[PDB]
Write a protein that binds this ligand. Structure first.
Ligand SMILES: CC(C)(COP(=O)(O)OP(=O)(O)OC[C@H]1O[C@@H](n2cnc3c(N)ncnc32)[C@H](O)[C@@H]1OP(=O)(O)O)[C@@H](O)C(=O)NCCC(=O)NCCNC(=O)Cc1cc(O)cc(O)c1
Ligand SMILES: CC(C)(COP(=O)(O)OP(=O)(O)OC[C@H]1O[C@@H](n2cnc3c(N)ncnc32)[C@H](O)[C@@H]1OP(=O)(O)O)[C@@H](O)C(=O)NCCC(=O)NCCNC(=O)Cc1cc(O)cc(O)c1
Ligand SMILES: CC(C)(COP(=O)(O)OP(=O)(O)OC[C@H]1O[C@@H](n2cnc3c(N)ncnc32)[C@H](O)[C@@H]1OP(=O)(O)O)[C@@H](O)C(=O)NCCC(=O)NCCNC(=O)Cc1cc(O)cc(O)c1
Ligand SMILES: CC(C)(COP(=O)(O)OP(=O)(O)OC[C@H]1O[C@@H](n2cnc3c(N)ncnc32)[C@H](O)[C@@H]1OP(=O)(O)O)[C@@H](O)C(=O)NCCC(=O)NCCNC(=O)Cc1cc(O)cc(O)c1
Lengths: 138, 418, 417, 421
């Protein structure tokens, strides 16, 4: 899961990953709302390692546990995915995830971030730094 | 003498009698399959009993009372000619070798019985293991040209001297370096050239770039024994399963036994050097076994190690000392797979490096093992880890245990499914 | 030579003093010192006699290694063929009637004997073969087990099911505390598991307990019966030595059969893979057993400890699982290891919540079916633990444990449970 | 046979060349190669002679293994009974008169001898017993120590207190760098600890240092005295070998006493449990010792390394013992590549039982000394060591060690590196 794909993992209730997967946020522009959310998953050191210095995290290393709930061999993954889908049905699950998200990330928190994000990201989109690098892909 | 040679010959006579008159392996009835199976068992049981008391006498005949060093191939062929019915001749192995594993009679098991009994003998055992540590004729042949060019290209291994480093590159681009009898010949020869070349100080083992569409442009260390050849009957008990353990793998641990043609030979009859391994892709099976004998192991972040119905060579001997009894049973008995980035990879791996940082990390490792002190220390280390008695006792039982597994019905089924 | 005469003189002095002196606990310090000095002179000569005469002694008892005698038969036969070398069945019966505090320690003489036998490269391996042979009780009960797939004994319930030898240790009143009978049942069950061709894997687990503190809960083992040990009911030979040379060694190496089946030329012993499931805790000898299985499972709330006598062969095996530092922590300093802490993986393969344990156990029993597993576990065990290694240890164990069984500090602490 | 004559002729050739040739540093390349070839031809015959005659030689020196001779006594007696087999006391005195660079390496001949002796299943175990017997020095000092509870030696201060033999390595000026005297003081102290009936546990710790960079701070050990090694003052026999077969092995197996007390039939040796406390760091031979204790404590800031090997020589028996503590990978990292291990990193839990802050260290040491009193501990540690490290295992290793280390002691690269400290 790279870039915007990795960003999505910061918002789910359960994350599973195959033993041979990796996660990265590789530069140029801002990685969506990862700057808002990664710190709460991984702390201030690791999130700068991932975002500012492009550190890559492998599913099987200990700190992958900061982003991923289960790491499973490819053969054993499909069945484990099914088992995880049975464990979240309650109305209690809805009430508890509603309170969890509320505490993790407040309306003000998200709004304040996205406000600055709208301009900061727009500027990054037209910086000489990004335009050249992305134009060397391949 | 004590009657056992007569009983053996009488038991071998019945087996050849039954094989001559009975139908083919695939056309036999249950009664016929039980008659021949019983004939085999009675004969092999006497091969064990004969050799339990007469092993040293047999070996002394073949080796002139342990004064001539015979390699494995030469030994089992000489025993066949000196002791008919004790081990297959050659004309018999050729018939066996034409058949698929399913249809074989299992004559190699008789070789397992022979090699087990020899290796158990405190006099013959150490003599045979020295024989297998001496330089191969192929390497002695190729040494002057290698000293001059610093390059030898073989079918399964490309060897290159550069900066005092023997660079062995396993280059079976089409099969992820799947092992066969030829690969063992190239590996043993390549190791010999590295050890005897005075301009070589450290060795390096690494898998080359692959051509198969699924791994094109990517290095792969090893995918283990060639399962296709095993199913087709092309994997030799002596010339592959045993040869690699007593030859090049053991020369990595102890070195090559030279004559007495240089100063020092009184204290170091063997020339040994340190070895570095770098795992790209994955190390499966026999490739993973090799890692248990190196002085430094490096592997890329995305690689994995596994040992997947036969014995994984000397991994049963060595893995527990790296990983303890629990994990070594987990890996061997239950096929656990270990990833380069997980904590317990450090039981097998010194360094794990991102692919973009791997080539340079390998280079730095080759500079750090140059001393004569390194040679003394790895020698004292290996001596402590794995004793001559220890290794010899294991390989003895292995020769028979692996021989039977090579012909187990569940093995023949599993390997034949591709 | 002269040593047998000097020995007979020293034993005569001991039996003379024991006849004339008062009972243990009514002796004076002067009297206690006289008898202790006589014991010391006698046992020192038992050592000196056997250092040179062990092989001749064993050869007389075994027809130059022509007859496989188990331990009990060996020490008894030794007593009648060599009076004063080891205690008689009578002398042992008097000892057994006493509490450990008051015993003379005649068993130490058996410790001396078994040490010298096991030290012999000729007699040692022969006795270890004898103890690997199937027990007569199992040969007796095998047909009925083949036909009923069930045998209920005092301390162990055995059931064949789905090709699995299910051993369930079911002393519900005492947390599976071990005694001589448990060893008789454990060895018998292991034999049946190995000789039954309808059995492919074994399983050892503790049964549901009835004691009020654990009612409805399974518990693996709480170690040796300390009450019996204090009361004098723990036999050096028939418990401490029998279990190490019998069922525990058969878990590693299998049963040594007669040459009465094909294969015997390459496989004289029938061995199978073994799975252990630890509920509650594994203490003492129960924790010791875990060092010998091919798969070990434990519930999240369990712990392992070795708590003053030698913990069987734990001193032999723990170092290979955990290294020299942790093994001294566990053995010398009584460290207790919990299933959920990292270093439990040195002893345990899976740690599972109790609600998921039953199914997790079942899955493991399907994963050890191959003949490949049988070939692999044999080569693994051979590399882990050599014949010389085991024999060298158990020889010394025979004396060291014999002495620890009768030390003043041991007798004191065992009487305070 | 003929091998003794061939040896005596080869040694004669060497003595001739040494007499007629210029000194070491004034020799030509042709002269350097001629003498080297003579040494090799002679030493090769010392190996071949002893391969068949080791048992007979040892039998003459020890009266068929009924007299226990220590190393120094053995290698001298061998010199006089078998001229040319091993150097004389006079030849050795000249050797130590030179710096290591200029030596002929006659000690290599002692390595050849001791290897062959230890390889013998009969002579080997006998020599290892001799070295486990009490030293005369300790037997000498045992009465006053029993009375006083105190012995001050040059390199070690010994004190009995609360049933604890407190050994304090007290080379305040050099971070407890080891030399031949230190080995003598260590073995003497260890002997006294074992024979003293008032001692129940042992304790080894480094004393307060006076050197300006470490004034007021304890330091465990900084390894072999590299200065002395360069100057030629480190003996193969009296240091590198004496320490392994003497006091370090006595920590494992105890002192072999006479048949002079009850129990001597089940317990021929007196052994006790030992505790080590590492302040500052444990380097080289100091770190080697840790592989042999029953409890090891260290302050949070200390580190462990074995920087022999890459540098010059084999790190004692660490090659024998480290793998069982840390496995083949980590043990090669430490030995082959000079990896350093810090007390607070996870893997210090391969060598060390407790790592505690400097302000809490003394109290932890005291508490640990209270936990190893039993006769049960003694039987248990005895069964453990028996399993961890067999008599054959140790003997096989030290035999090869005797020759391998001797050659490293005179290696071209070692002499260079040791002279730069
Ligand atoms: C994973 C890889 C290392 C593997 O590549 P290789 O194994 O060398 O294979 P390739 O041949 O490149 O892969 C096959 C295929 O994938 C295609 N591919 C891979 N990545 C891309 C991207 N990013 N765009 C388009 N196509 C792609 C590539 O075009 C190939 O097709 P061909 O043209 O037929 O060759 C590689 O794909 C790679 O490095 N890709 C670049 C990854 C990258 O940087 N992606 C963008 C990350 N940045 C963000 O998400 C930023 C972001 C996202 C947001 O949603 C919001 C926001 O605010 C900021
Ligand atoms: C590597 C894999 C996991 C992934 O491969 P995929 O990416 O799924 O691609 P595949 O197409 O399977 O493999 C790519 C390519 O290599 C070929 N390949 C890879 N490994 C092999 C082997 N082992 N044999 C033959 N061909 C092979 C495979 O056939 C493909 O080529 P084509 O068939 O010609 O198209 C898979 O190939 C696989 O499962 N391989 C088998 C691995 C294995 O179990 N090997 C043997 C392990 N056992 C030993 O080493 C036993 C041993 C060896 C010894 O030397 C001594 C001893 O005592 C015991
Ligand atoms: C199990 C415990 C931790 C649980 O705590 P509680 O639940 O509070 O305890 P208890 O009430 O005592 O346990 C419940 C119940 O089991 C009984 N129980 C448990 N273990 C025993 C033993 N070993 N003997 C007798 N009774 C026992 C206990 O007596 C209670 O029953 P009541 O007498 O009816 O009250 C505790 O009971 C305890 O510490 N037990 C002692 C454990 C122990 O020291 N075991 C053995 C230690 N040493 C060896 O095995 C040594 C050994 C064994 C060998 O096989 C070989 C060898 O060479 C060396
Ligand atoms: C630990 C250190 C970094 C300390 O750093 P600093 O605080 O900068 O220290 P220094 O100021 O140098 O230390 C003070 C002082 O102690 C003395 N000192 C320190 N270490 C040593 C050593 N190793 N030898 C001798 N003297 C020493 C030296 O005299 C120093 O300076 P001066 O007195 O002014 O000359 C440093 O001392 C160091 O690196 N020392 C070298 C240690 C080393 O490599 N030792 C070799 C270890 N290897 C063996 O023992 C091998 C061995 C031993 C055996 O017993 C058996 C065997 O088979 C093999």
């Amino acid at each position: 899961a790279i870039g915007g794909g990795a960003q999505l993992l910061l918002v789910f209730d359960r994350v599973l990953a195959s033993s041979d997967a990796y996660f990265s946020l590789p530069a140029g522009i801002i990685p969506g709302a990862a700057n808002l959310r990664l710190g709460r998953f991984a702390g201030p050191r690791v999130s700068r390692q991932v975002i500012l210095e492009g550190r890559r995290i492998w599913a099987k290393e200990p700190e992958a546990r900061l982003l991923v709930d289960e790491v499973v061999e490819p053969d054993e993954l499909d069945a484990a995915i099914e088992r995880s889908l049975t464990r979240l049905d309650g109305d209690a699950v809805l009430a508890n995830r509603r309170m969890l998200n509320l505490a993790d990330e407040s309306p003000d928190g998200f709004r304040a971030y996205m406000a600055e994000f709208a301009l900061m990201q727009a500027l990054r989109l037209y910086g000489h730094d990004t335009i050249d690098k992305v134009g060397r892909f391949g | 003498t004590d009657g056992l040679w007569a009983a053996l010959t009488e038991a071998a006579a019945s087996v050849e009698k039954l094989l001559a008159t009975l139908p083919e392996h695939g056309a036999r009835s249950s009664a016929e399959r039980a008659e021949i199976a019983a004939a085999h068992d009675a004969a092999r049981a006497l091969r064990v009993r004969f050799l339990d008391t007469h092993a040293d006498a047999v070996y002394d005949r073949l080796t002139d009372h342990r004064r001539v060093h015979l390699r494995l191939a030469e030994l089992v062929e000489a025993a066949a000619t000196a002791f008919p019915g004790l081990v297959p001749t050659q004309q018999q192995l050729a018939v066996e070798r034409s058949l698929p594993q399913a249809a074989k009679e299992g004559h190699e098991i008789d070789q397992g019985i022979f090699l087990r009994a020899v290796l158990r003998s405190p006099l013959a055992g150490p003599h045979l293991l020295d024989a297998m540590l001496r330089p191969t004729p192929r390497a002695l042949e190729l040494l002057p040209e290698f000293v001059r060019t610093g390059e030898v290209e073989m079918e399964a291994v490309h060897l290159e001297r550069r900066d005092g480093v023997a660079r062995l590159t396993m280059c079976r681009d089409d099969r992820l370096n799947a092992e066969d009898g030829q690969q063992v010949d190239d590996m043993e020869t390549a190791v010999d050239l590295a050890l005897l070349d005075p301009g070589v100080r450290v060795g390096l083992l690494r898998g080359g770039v692959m051509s198969h569409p699924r791994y094109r442009g990517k290095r792969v260390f090893s995918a283990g024994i060639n399962l296709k050849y095993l199913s087709q009957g092309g994997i030799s008990l002596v010339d592959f399963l045993m040869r690699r353990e007593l030859g090049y793998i053991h020369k990595l641990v102890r070195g090559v036994l030279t004559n007495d043609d240089r100063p020092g030979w009184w204290h170091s009859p063997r020339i040994e050097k340190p070895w570095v391994a770098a795992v790209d892709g994955f190390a499966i099976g026999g490739g993973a076994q090799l890692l248990l004998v190196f002085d430094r192991v490096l592997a890329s972040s995305d690689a994995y190690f596994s040992l997947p119905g036969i014995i994984p060579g000397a991994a049963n001997l060595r893995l527990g000392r790296f990983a303890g009894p629990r994990v070594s049973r987990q890996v061997i008995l239950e096929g656990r797979r270990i990833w380069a980035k997980e904590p317990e990879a450090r039981l097998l791996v010194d360094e794990v490096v991102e692919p973009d940082e791997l080539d340079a990390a390998i280079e730095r490792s080759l500079t750090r093992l140059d001393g004569d002190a390194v040679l003394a220390n790895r020698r004292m280390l290996n001596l402590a880890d794995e004793s001559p008695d220890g290794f010899r006792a294991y390989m003895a039982e292995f020769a028979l245990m692996q021989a039977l597994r090579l012909y187990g019905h569940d093995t023949i089924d599993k390997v034949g499914r591709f």
